[PDB]
Amino acid sequence: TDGAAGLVPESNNEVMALEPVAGAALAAPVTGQTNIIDPWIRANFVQAPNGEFTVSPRNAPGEVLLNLELGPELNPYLAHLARMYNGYAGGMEVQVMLAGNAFTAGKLVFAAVPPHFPVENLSPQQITMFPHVIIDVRTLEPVLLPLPDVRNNFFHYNQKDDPKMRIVAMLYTPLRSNGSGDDVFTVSCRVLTRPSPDFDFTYLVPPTVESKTKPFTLPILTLGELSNSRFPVSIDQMYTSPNEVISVQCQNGRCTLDGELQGTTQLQVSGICAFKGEVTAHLQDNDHLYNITITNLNGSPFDPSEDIPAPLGVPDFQGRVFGVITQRDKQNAAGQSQPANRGHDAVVPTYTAQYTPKLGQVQIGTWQTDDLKVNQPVKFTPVGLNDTEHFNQWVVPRYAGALNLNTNLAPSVAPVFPGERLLFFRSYLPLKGGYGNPAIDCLLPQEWVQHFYQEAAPSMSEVALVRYINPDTGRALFEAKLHRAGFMTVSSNTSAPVVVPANGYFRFDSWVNQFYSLAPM
Q: State the binding site for Zn(2+).
A: 282, 284, 288
Please state the closest distance from residue 12 (CB atom) to its own copies, in A. Answer: 11
**Choices 149-157, 251-259, 362-370, 481-489; region in contact with its own copies by CB under 8 A:** 149-157
User: Among residue numbers 355 through 394, which ones bind its own copies (CB under 8 A)?
Assistant: 379, 381, 383-384, 386
Choice between 13 and 284, CB closer to Zn ion: 284
- Rounded to an integer, what distance in angstroms lies between the CA atom of residue 373 and that of residue 375? 7
- Evaluate whether 297 touches 276 at the Cβ level (below 8 Å): yes
Binding residues: 282, 284, 288
By beta-carbon proximity to its own copies, the closer residue of 20 and 284 is 20
Determine how many CB atoms are found less than 10 A away from the CB of residue 399.
24
End-to-end CA distance of the chain: 35
Of the candidates 142, 114, 131, 133, the one whose C-alpha atom is nearest the C-alpha of residue 172 is 133
How far is it, in rounded angstroms, from Cα 521 to Cα 518?
A: 9
Instruction: Return the number of the residue (355 or 515) whose C-beta is nearest its own copies.
Output: 515
Is 409 a binding residue for its own copies by CB under 8 A? The answer is yes
Say which residues have a Cβ less than 8 Å from residue 161's Cβ, sequence separation at least 6: none
Give the Cα separation of 507 and 467 in Å (integer): 5
Q: Measured from the CB of residue 331, what is the shortest distance to Zn ion in angstroms?
A: 22
- Is 70 a binder of its own copies (CB under 8 A)? no
Q: In the bound complex, what is the minimum distance in angstroms from residue 492's beta carbon to its own copies?
A: 16
Which strands form 143-147's sheet, in the order they lie side by side?
46-55, 187-195, 92-97, 143-147
Nearer to Zn ion, 321 or 364 (CB): 364
Count CB neighbours of 438 within 10 A: 16
Output the smallest distance, CB 375 to its own copies, in A: 18
The alpha carbon of 285 is separated from its chain's Cα centroid by a whole number of angstroms, namely 47
Question: Which residues lie below 8 Å from residue 126, measured CB to CB, with a gap of 6+?
Answer: none
* Residues between 191 and 230 with contacts to its own copies, criterion CB under 8 A: 192, 203-211, 219-221, 224-228
Out of 88, 172, 275, 399, the residue judged to bind its own copies by CB under 8 A? 172
Selected binder of its own copies within 15, 32, 281, 370 (CB under 8 A): 32
Give yes or no for residue 284 binding Zn ion (CB under 5 A).
yes
Minimum CB separation of residue 370 from Zn ion in Å reads 4
Interface of this chain with Zn ion, residues 348 to 377, rule: CB under 5 A: 370
Among residue numbers 290 through 349, which ones bind its own copies (CB under 8 A)? 297-298, 303, 305, 322, 324, 326, 328, 332, 334-335, 337-343
Residue (81 or 362) nearer to its own copies, CB? 81
In Å, the largest CA–CA distance within the chain is 96
Task: Compute the C-alpha angle 78/84/85, nearest 5°.
Answer: 80
Nearer to its own copies, 351 or 508 (CB): 508
The single residue among 283, 353, 374, 502 that binds its own copies, judged by CB under 8 A, is 502
Cβ atoms of residues 408 and 258 within 8 Å: no
Alpha-carbon distance 428 to 384, whole Å? Answer: 10
Tell me which of Zn ion, its own copies, none is bound by residue 133, counting a contact when its beta carbon lies within the kind-specific cut-off of 5 to 8 angstroms. none
DSSP structural state of residue 28: G
- Say how many residues make up the chain: 521
Residues 288-317 that bind Zn ion (CB under 5 A): 288
Q: Can residue 148 be called a binding residue for its own copies (CB under 8 A)?
A: yes
Site of interaction with Zn ion (CB under 5 A): 284, 288, 370
